[PDB]
Amino acid sequence: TKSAGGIVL
């Protein structure tokens, strides 16, 4: 699951 952008969490 990523951020709005995608900060591969």
Curated annotation (Swiss-Prot):
Localization per record: Cytoplasm
Domain of life: Bacteria
Function, in words: Together with the chaperonin GroEL, plays an essential role in assisting protein folding. The GroEL-GroES system forms a nano-cage that allows encapsulation of the non-native substrate proteins and provides a physical environment optimized to promote and accelerate protein folding, probably by preventing aggregation and by entropically destabilizing folding intermediates. GroES binds to the apical surface of the GroEL ring, thereby capping the opening of the GroEL channel. Regulates the ATPase activity of GroEL. (Microbial infection) Essential for the assembly of several bacteriophages.
Family that this chain belongs to: Belongs to the GroES chaperonin family.
Subunit structure: Heptamer of 7 subunits arranged in a ring. Interacts with the chaperonin GroEL. Can form asymmetrical complexes, composed of one GroEL and one GroES, and symmetrical complexes, formed between one GroEL and two GroES oligomers. The asymmetrical complex is the functional unit. It was suggested that the symmetric heterooligomer may represent a transient intermediate in the chaperonin protein folding cycle. Another study shows that the symmetric heterooligomers are substantially populated only in the presence of proteins that cannot be folded by the chaperonin.
Name of the protein in its database record: Co-chaperonin GroES
Organism: Escherichia coli (strain K12)
Species lineage: Bacteria, Pseudomonadati, Pseudomonadota, Gammaproteobacteria, Enterobacterales
Section covered of the full-length record: 19 to 27 of 97
